Symmetry: C3
Subunit: 29 residues, 3 copies
């Protein structure tokens, strides 16, 4: 379970960093 959580968490961090930048282009900055 821990290794599985590790993969899910790494994927989420990747998606969230991309989302953060996408939105940054639309507002604030």
């Amino acid at each position: 379970e821990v290794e599985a959580l590790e993969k899910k968490v790494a994927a989420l961090e990747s998606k969230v960093q991309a989302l953060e930048k996408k939105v940054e282009a639309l507002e604030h900055g």
Copy 2:
């Protein structure tokens, strides 16, 4: 702790998938 992390991670995946689509309507696609 692991089960608790599992629930938090599943919730985040759900929120991130919805956010991804919301933003998709605004930009690229």
Copy 3:
């Protein structure tokens, strides 16, 4: 590893809540 996952997950929840609100200003609401 578990404590490390805890920190990554807490950070993600924080970022996702902020993103959710940012986007809310742009669409639906």
